[PDB]
Amino acid sequence: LLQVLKRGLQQVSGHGGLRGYLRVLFRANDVRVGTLVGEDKYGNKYYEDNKQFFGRHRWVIYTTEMNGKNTFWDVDGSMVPPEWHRWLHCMTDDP
Amino acid sequence: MFMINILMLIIPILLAVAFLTLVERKVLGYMQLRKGPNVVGPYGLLQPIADAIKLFIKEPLRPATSSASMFILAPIMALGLALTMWIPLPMPYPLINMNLGVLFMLAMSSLAVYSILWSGWASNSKYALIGALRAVAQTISYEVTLAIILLSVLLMSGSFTLSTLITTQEQMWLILPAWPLAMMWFISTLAETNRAPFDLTEGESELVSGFAGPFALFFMAEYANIIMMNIFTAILFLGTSHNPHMPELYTINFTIKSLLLTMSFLWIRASYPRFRYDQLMHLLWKNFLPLTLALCMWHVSLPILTSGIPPQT
Amino acid sequence: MWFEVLPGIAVMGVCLFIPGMATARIHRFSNGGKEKRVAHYPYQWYLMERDRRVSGVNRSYVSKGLENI
Amino acid sequence: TYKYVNLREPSMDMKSVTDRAAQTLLWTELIRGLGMTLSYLFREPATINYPFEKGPLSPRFRGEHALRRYPSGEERCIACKLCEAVCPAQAITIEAEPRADGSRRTTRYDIDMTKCIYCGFCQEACPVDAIVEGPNFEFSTETHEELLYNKEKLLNNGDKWEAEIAANIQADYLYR
Amino acid sequence: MNLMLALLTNFTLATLLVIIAFWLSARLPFSMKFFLVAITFLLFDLEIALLLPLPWASQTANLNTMLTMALFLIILLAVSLAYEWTQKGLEWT
Amino acid sequence: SNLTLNFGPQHPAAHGVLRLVMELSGEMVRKCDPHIGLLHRGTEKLIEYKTYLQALPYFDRLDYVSMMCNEQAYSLAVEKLLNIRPPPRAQWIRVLFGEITRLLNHIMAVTTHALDIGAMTPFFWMFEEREKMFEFYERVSGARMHAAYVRPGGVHQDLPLGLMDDIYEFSKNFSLRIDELEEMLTNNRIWRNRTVDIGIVTAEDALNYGFSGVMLRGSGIQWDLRKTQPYDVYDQVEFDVPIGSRGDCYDRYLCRVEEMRQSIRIISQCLNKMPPGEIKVDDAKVSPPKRAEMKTSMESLIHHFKLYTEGYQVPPGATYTAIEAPKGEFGVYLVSDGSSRPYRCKIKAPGFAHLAGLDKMSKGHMLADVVAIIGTQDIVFGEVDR
Amino acid sequence: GEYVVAKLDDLINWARRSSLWPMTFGLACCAVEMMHMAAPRYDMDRFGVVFRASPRQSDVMIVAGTLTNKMAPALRKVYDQMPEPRYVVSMGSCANGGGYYHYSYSVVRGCDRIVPVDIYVPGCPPTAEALLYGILQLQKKIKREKRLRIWYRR
Numbered sequence A: 001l002l003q004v005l006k007r008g009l010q011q012v013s014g015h016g017g018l019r020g021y022l023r024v025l026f027r028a029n030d031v032r033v034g035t036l037v038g039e040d041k042y043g044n045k046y047y048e049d050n051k052q053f054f055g056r057h058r059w060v061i062y063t064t065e066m067n068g069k070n071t072f073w074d075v076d077g078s079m080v081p082p083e084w085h086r087w088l089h090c091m092t093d094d095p
Numbered sequence B: 001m002f003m004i005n006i007l008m009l010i011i012p013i014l015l016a017v018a019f020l021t022l023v024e025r026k027v028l029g030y031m032q033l034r035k036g037p038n039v040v041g042p043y044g045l046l047q048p049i050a051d052a053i054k055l056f057i058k059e060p061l062r063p064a065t066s067s068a069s070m071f072i073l074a075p076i077m078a079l080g081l082a083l084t085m086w087i088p089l090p091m092p093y094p095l096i097n098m099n100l101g102v103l104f105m106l107a108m109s110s111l112a113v114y115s116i117l118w119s120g121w122a123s124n125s126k127y128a129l130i131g132a133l134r135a136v137a138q139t140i141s142y143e144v145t146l147a148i149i150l151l152s153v154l155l156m157s158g159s160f161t162l163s164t165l166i167t168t169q170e171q172m173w174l175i176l177p178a179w180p181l182a183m184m185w186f187i188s189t190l191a192e193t194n195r196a197p198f199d200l201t202e203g204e205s206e207l208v209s210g211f212a213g214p215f216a217l218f219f220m221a222e223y224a225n226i227i228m229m230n231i232f233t234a235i236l237f238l239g240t241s242h243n244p245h246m247p248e249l250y251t252i253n254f255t256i257k258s259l260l261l262t263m264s265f266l267w268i269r270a271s272y273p274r275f276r277y278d279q280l281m282h283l284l285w286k287n288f289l290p291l292t293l294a295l296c297m298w299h300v301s302l303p304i305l306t307s308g309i310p311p312q313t
Numbered sequence C: 001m002w003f004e005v006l007p008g009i010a011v012m013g014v015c016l017f018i019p020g021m022a023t024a025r026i027h028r029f030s031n032g033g034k035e036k037r038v039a040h041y042p043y044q045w046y047l048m049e050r051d052r053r054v055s056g057v058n059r060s061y062v063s064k065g066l067e068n069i
Numbered sequence D: 001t002y003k004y005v006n007l008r009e010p011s012m013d014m015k016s017v018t019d020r021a022a023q024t025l026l027w028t029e030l031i032r033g034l035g036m037t038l039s040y041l042f043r044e045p046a047t048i049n050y051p052f053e054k055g056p057l058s059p060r061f062r063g064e065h066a067l068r069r070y071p072s073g074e075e076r077c078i079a080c081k082l083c084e085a086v087c088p089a090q091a092i093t094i095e096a097e098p099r100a101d102g103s104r105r106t107t108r109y110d111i112d113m114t115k116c117i118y119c120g121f122c123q124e125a126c127p128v129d130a131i132v133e134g135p136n137f138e139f140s141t142e143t144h145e146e147l148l149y150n151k152e153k154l155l156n157n158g159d160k161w162e163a164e165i166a167a168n169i170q171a172d173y174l175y176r
Numbered sequence E: 001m002n003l004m005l006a007l008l009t010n011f012t013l014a015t016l017l018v019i020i021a022f023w024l025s026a027r028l029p030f031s032m033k034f035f036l037v038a039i040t041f042l043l044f045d046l047e048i049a050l051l052l053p054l055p056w057a058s059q060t061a062n063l064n065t066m067l068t069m070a071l072f073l074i075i076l077l078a079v080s081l082a083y084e085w086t087q088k089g090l091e092w093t
Numbered sequence F: 001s002n003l004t005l006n007f008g009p010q011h012p013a014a015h016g017v018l019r020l021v022m023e024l025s026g027e028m029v030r031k032c033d034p035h036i037g038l039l040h041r042g043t044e045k046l047i048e049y050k051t052y053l054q055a056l057p058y059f060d061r062l063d064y065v066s067m068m069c070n071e072q073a074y075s076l077a078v079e080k081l082l083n084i085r086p087p088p089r090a091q092w093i094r095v096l097f098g099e100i101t102r103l104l105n106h107i108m109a110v111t112t113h114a115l116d117i118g119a120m121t122p123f124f125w126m127f128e129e130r131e132k133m134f135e136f137y138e139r140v141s142g143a144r145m146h147a148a149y150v151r152p153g154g155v156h157q158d159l160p161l162g163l164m165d166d167i168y169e170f171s172k173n174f175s176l177r178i179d180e181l182e183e184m185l186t187n188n189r190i191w192r193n194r195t196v197d198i199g200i201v202t203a204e205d206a207l208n209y210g211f212s213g214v215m216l217r218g219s220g221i222q223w224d225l226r227k228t229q230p231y232d233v234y235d236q237v238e239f240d241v242p243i244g245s246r247g248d249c250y251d252r253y254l255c256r257v258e259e260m261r262q263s264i265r266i267i268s269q270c271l272n273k274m275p276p277g278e279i280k281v282d283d284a285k286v287s288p289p290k291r292a293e294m295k296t297s298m299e300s301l302i303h304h305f306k307l308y309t310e311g312y313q314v315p316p317g318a319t320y321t322a323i324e325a326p327k328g329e330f331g332v333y334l335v336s337d338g339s340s341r342p343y344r345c346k347i348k349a350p351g352f353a354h355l356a357g358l359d360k361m362s363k364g365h366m367l368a369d370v371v372a373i374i375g376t377q378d379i380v381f382g383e384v385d386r
Numbered sequence G: 001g002e003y004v005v006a007k008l009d010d011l012i013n014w015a016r017r018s019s020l021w022p023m024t025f026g027l028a029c030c031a032v033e034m035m036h037m038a039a040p041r042y043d044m045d046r047f048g049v050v051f052r053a054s055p056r057q058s059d060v061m062i063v064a065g066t067l068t069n070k071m072a073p074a075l076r077k078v079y080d081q082m083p084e085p086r087y088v089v090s091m092g093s094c095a096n097g098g099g100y101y102h103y104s105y106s107v108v109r110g111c112d113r114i115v116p117v118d119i120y121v122p123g124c125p126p127t128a129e130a131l132l133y134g135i136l137q138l139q140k141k142i143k144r145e146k147r148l149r150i151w152y153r154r
Ligand SMILES: CCCCCCCCCCCCCCCCCC(=O)OC[C@H](COP(=O)(O)OCCN)OC(=O)CCCCCCCCCCCCCCCCC
Pocket: B180, B181, B182, B183, B184, B186, B187, B233, B237, B268, B287, B288, B291, B298, D024, D025, D026, D027, D030, D031, F189
């Protein structure tokens, strides 16, 4: 139980402080830390954690601006470009 | 200072009711292998606020009641009586220390059904009145066992004062000597508050074809009654030791027991199918009532034959 | 995970903690730091009335001891 | 071969009778059900964080349609009208004529996306892999008219999604 | 004085919340059985009025008399239930 | 008096809307008059304007919980009029996905049966399993539900590499999931109070009213079309037919739960006995050739062109072909006039006769027992109304 | 005045879109994928979209399946009994424009002939994720509303 609490605190640091921790919590409603698989030209960031169960082992943190639109709060699934769309939906294994 | 005392009872009740809707949705979500609200506010903490505002700015049904005088009276009676049941609760000190507190709550709870009836008449529909008579017939039936079970427990307490239940359980919870009564008491409250598996008004309404702000007020009244039943159940059967110097120690332990009992209605709703209307009537008139009458006989005799008669004071 | 249900339970728990704690605190404030006197029967009311006279300020919860003998 | 699902005779020895009486009076079989829902409360939920997480799909997934090109940029479609012929919903409307260079190409290629059943028969019938159902499924609109695709819309879908469509075709064409 | 003020506050707030929420003769075919449920409730409720004094009745010197009359009343309650039961007053078919 | 049951529950439900006109006396049901047609879409007339391939997707949308089983029935009827035979690997795939589909249907049948009665938690546990089986549908066909995968001649495509291992992984853990479902319902006194001795139907009445499937086997009738009149490779797999003894809702509920266990038993054999080879009849006048052949061979291209425009012609004749669908006997009376479009296509939906028996089965029951009785028949108004 | 109205719309738009209680017409196939959106993988309840509601407590009607001429009057009546604000989501080809039964004598060629539609969700059936995308698209549509700004400028 002590190690469970430690993992919780490592997520705050894993998100570059409390401000970046609260940022993803209110943007994505999730504070998991993953491995940055890559980033596309629009600013979307792609993460993986194969320790998670299938369907949660890959995710994207959407960019805050895309094509002159403010997407800090307004994100949607159509913002993923086709090259990453294949990876995010597990149609392929290779990013 | 007494007005202030009234407010720090009323307002915390309505906030507790608002967030019970969140807790119910999330406890049921996880028992169903999902999450429940977790987007509107961190961990869904703003979901009750979003629902409250949504319901109040929602256009009313424009129903055209048959009695405007009594269309409005029903929700006022439901919510006014629900708040009234809290004033004699010793937590550990009651807002009003009533010598006959148990009778007061038994008497006030007997008036709850008037709101069910008055809404049926105000419905202006044959089917809504029939539904109101089935809810009333179920509620009053399960009031019979609650009154007798309550009396049987008071024969070991010796008073109608709710604080005496705390003294009665200084050395031991009443659940030990009276666990058979505790079981039927708990199920009677589920049936009394029309909760699953006894949620027949919600179910039979979902069948018959024909049968927002006012909905919200009715909802809060029902959920404030659920919390109060479980607080009363903890006081009645799981009495918390009271330290006069550290009174908030009693409140913490008492609150945890109430939450666990309230969370158990949620647990039960997640676990069982729904009774059929005649089947929950057979449950009371042919199972609980014969056993409650026999245990009422037992609990009158038991203190006498053991020389364990409690004092009046 | 299941522990994400606790924040909702904590808020509802604090909401149910305020009434019992508020009544106890206000009683101590209103009764000079003591429990509010309980008078259910005529005897207890008689002594509360007598204490009100004895105190000399019309306050039953002001207690007079051996210093008035 | 058969088996009986409910052909058991209860044992009437006093012990077994008392076992059933305890179940009735003490609700033991109801307590057991409460254990099962309790065990789920402490299990990890199956929910995924949409839209940040997505449901897994395969290269065969039949989503939004697109018209494809050769690597040169020439359109693959030659207005053969096999897709229009096979479409179970009559959702495709095609017209064609000789292009200014004499090429056999369409002047109209419409797909009523509110008639379509997303069955993929058109992409099976196409002899040149011109029409495909792409991987996009997040294209709901606010008006009916936006779901009546013409050739410009479908060609733009091909240019938009070709990077992923080509990869999906590469991963599945040996099963076709 | 305190109880009335508590009662006034509860119902005054209920009216206040209600007004915000709202603005800012023949024979019903309902069965005989449901009538006899209400009448059964009343008669049982009346016999429950008589049992309420029992927690005070147990302090009496005349315990033999009290206990006999306490069980006598509850047994008549049982016999009343037994009679409706055997006269098919509890059946819903 | 006179009531009308609502179109559907307040919670989300997928089986169609019913207009049930009820006669009651007190709590008792005196008459049930089902008014259907609220989902009648003229499927059978539409099929007459389609080629035999174009009509196949109409069958996914009948009992739209048992998609591939409906496809198999239509494919068997067409293959019988064509006088051809699908290849053995296709037959094994069709039985494999027939049993996967039976799991899909029985989960929907049993957990929505509990959900309507108010036992709602098992619904959520078991549609996570249905979600994983939707992934199997989408991996072979690209569609989660309406696959159009089984076709006259075999199956459209071969299993993707790695699919069978995943099906094995799912089947490994599934029996425990059925066990948890039974923990909530089987011995629950409330569930039994809602189901035992409800909607009793005698063996003779069941036959004369045209029942099939579990509606027959719940009354002790020893009939299963997979045993008596086997199709595809069902005569090469071992399984037991569950038989009820009391003919009521509870016995039919147990039959469906046991049928789920037998489906897992059959799936285990299909995974181990899957043979190699082609997936559609090697006969390019019925089944389209491979895309590589279509782009290299003159004969292949011609046959591709004709199969996808005119379609294949079916010799004139009429067949009634039926299978053991998850909901009972699902059949098609298919009439060919020698052309490439069916002349007539009557669909025998097992729920059509079952809902016609609701009035009989509900006599002398309570208003809430009608909920359980429509539940135990497992009605999808897509197949009832066509 | 101008500032308050802007922040006030922000509040009520937040409340209405964060608490979307749906009435689903499970007419046909598409209701199955609708159930899968309520199932644990997507858990529509976590967005505030409750499981069960009742027509007279609902904010959004989801027409999930084929609408026949026989069913058309009953669907319109439910829409007419919904308290406002009310939205309609057309789910799948049948409800969108008739779909695979478009040319049938007994099918309404699109539910938008009977009720006004806010969102059209394509597919036959749309995947549960596609429907969830459409529901979150409707939330964005509500987030764009400006009832008080328009009212204040009348
Ligand atoms: C030394 C001498 C001493 C003398 C005294 C000795 C006493 C001996 C007697 C001991 C046993 C008494 C048991 C009393 C408990 C009540 C029993 C009961 O009423 O259960 C029977 C009831 C009927 O069920 P059924 O299957 O239909 O039986 C056929 C009836 N014709 O079944 C039901 O109630 C069904 C209830 C369904 C709903 C339950 C759902 C919740 C279950 C978990 C709740 C756990 C309770 C938690 C308690 C919390 C308390 C704070």
